[PDB]
Design an enzyme around this catalytic site. Structure first.
Site, PDB file in Angstrom:
ATOM      1  N   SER A  64      69.269  33.504 -13.345  1.00  0.00           N
ATOM      2  CA  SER A  64      69.968  34.792 -13.225  1.00  0.00           C
ATOM      3  C   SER A  64      71.129  35.037 -14.180  1.00  0.00           C
ATOM      4  CB  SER A  64      70.443  35.024 -11.787  1.00  0.00           C
ATOM      5  OG  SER A  64      69.354  35.341 -10.916  1.00  0.00           O
TER       6      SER A  64
ATOM      7  N   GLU B 176      59.844  35.989 -11.824  1.00  0.00           N
ATOM      8  CA  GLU B 176      59.060  34.984 -12.538  1.00  0.00           C
ATOM      9  C   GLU B 176      59.839  34.143 -13.542  1.00  0.00           C
ATOM     10  OE1 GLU B 176      58.129  38.369 -12.371  1.00  0.00           O
ATOM     11  OE2 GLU B 176      57.376  37.728 -10.411  1.00  0.00           O
TER      12      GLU B 176
HETATM   13  O1  LIG Z   1      69.083  33.143 -10.633  1.00  0.00           O
HETATM   14  C1  LIG Z   1      69.016  34.265 -10.133  1.00  0.00           C
HETATM   15  C2  LIG Z   1      68.181  34.468  -9.040  1.00  0.00           C
HETATM   16  C3  LIG Z   1      67.302  33.453  -8.683  1.00  0.00           C
HETATM   17  N1  LIG Z   1      66.486  33.588  -7.654  1.00  0.00           N
HETATM   18  C4  LIG Z   1      65.561  32.499  -7.308  1.00  0.00           C
HETATM   19  C5  LIG Z   1      66.335  31.273  -6.882  1.00  0.00           C
HETATM   20  O2  LIG Z   1      67.526  31.364  -6.586  1.00  0.00           O
HETATM   21  C6  LIG Z   1      65.623  29.920  -6.830  1.00  0.00           C
HETATM   22  C7  LIG Z   1      64.785  29.782  -5.557  1.00  0.00           C
HETATM   23  O3  LIG Z   1      64.098  28.528  -5.568  1.00  0.00           O
END
Ligand SMILES: O=C/C=C/NCC(O)CC=O
Ligand SMILES: OC[C@H]1O[C@H](O[C@H]2[C@H](O)[C@@H](O)[C@H](OCCCCCCC3CCCCC3)O[C@@H]2CO)[C@H](O)[C@@H](O)[C@@H]1O
EC number: 3.5.2.6
Length: 265
Positions: free
Chosen positions: A45, A143
């Site tokens: 993220s 993804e």
């Molecule tokens: O990094 C930003 C958002 C990420 N979302 C997915 C997870 O946090 C990992 C879940 O296993």
């Protein structure tokens, strides 16, 4: 706490994973600490800050407005949309979308913004345009967190991400108002900001964007400094560790503690 480099090493030993880190003066770009700085790590993220930098560039050029309201549909939503799922009826402005993507890690907001800049390919082109020849986004919001070992998709390097954040926040590539907006969004992080402040000694400034993915992937891009000043950019990524989220968080906090106890380098 031991010296920063000693702590970073200890963190890899304890996590059985790779840690990538850069500590850089925000104003000048002086690199203080560099560990696996040229190795690839999943951005997870943290890509959202670069995304909103591209959005602000469009605003500066008159091709976008933070006020512009975007209406979307329920079928457009992806996993984890705390803010965007509440506005199917009234929509969200481009600026609200950036706030949601950065301060609440709203994935649909990030995807909606990504569409406005030409998708993963458009964001990657923007990075190339500001001189980052390494960072790459290939997939959409959910993804891109897959973090498959050896997969170069959706990765950056600590050195590239630090330089790119510095360019967006201080190089005058973005207008003064846009640089101020990007910084305020990071200051406003609701996911990790309050928690970090609760464990930081009085007087330490924090602005940040965090992220998490599979196979232990974790990341944080932040501004940190004593005397309530954003003195340094600190970028830390973790990859390929089977450790609990709690321990990965503790190790990152530990690297931070080492920085705090040995700041004047
Ligand atoms: O990094 C930003 C958002 C990420 N979302 C997915 C997870 O946090 C990992 C879940 O296993
Ligand atoms: O001597 C320095 C300080 O040493 C301790 O502070 C501790 C603090 O009590 C602890 O909670 C924190 O944990 C680290 C918290 C860091 C959280 C995130 C850091 C991020 C920020 C930037 C990107 C990566 C990591 O460490 C410091 C330094 O040892 C004392 O409690 C404090 O009174 C004193 O001023």
């Amino acid at each position: 706490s031991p010296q920063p480099l000693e702590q970073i090493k200890l963190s890899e030993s304890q996590l059985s994973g790779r840690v990538g880190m850069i500590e850089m003066d925000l104003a000048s770009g002086r690199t203080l600490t560099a560990w696996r700085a040229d190795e690839r790590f999943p951005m997870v993220s943290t890509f959202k800050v670069v995304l909103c930098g591209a959005v602000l560039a469009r605003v500066d050029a008159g091709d976008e407005q933070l006020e512009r309201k975007i209406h979307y549909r329920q079928q457009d939503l992806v996993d984890y949309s705390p803010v965007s799922e509440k506005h199917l009826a009234d929509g969200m402005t481009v600026g609200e979308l950036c706030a949601a993507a950065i301060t609440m890690s709203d994935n649909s907001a990030a995807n909606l913004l990504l569409a406005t800049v030409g998708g993963p390919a458009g964001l990657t082109a923007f990075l190339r345009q500001i001189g980052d020849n390494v960072t790459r986004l290939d997939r959409w919001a959910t993804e891109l967190n897959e973090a498959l070992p050896g997969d170069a998709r959706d990765t950056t390097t600590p050195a590239s991400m630090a330089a790119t954040l510095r360019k967006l926040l201080t190089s005058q590539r973005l207008s003064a108002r846009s640089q101020r907006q990007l910084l305020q969004w990071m200051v406003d992080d609701r996911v990790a900001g309050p928690l970090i402040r609760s464990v930081l000694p009085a007087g330490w400034f924090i602005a940040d964007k965090t992220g998490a993915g599979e196979r232990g992937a974790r990341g944080i891009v932040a501004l940190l400094g004593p005397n309530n000043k954003a003195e340094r950019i600190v970028v830390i990524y973790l990859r390929d560790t089977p450790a609990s989220m709690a321990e990965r968080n503790q190790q990152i906090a530990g690297i931070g503690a080492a920085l705090i106890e040995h700041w004047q380098r």
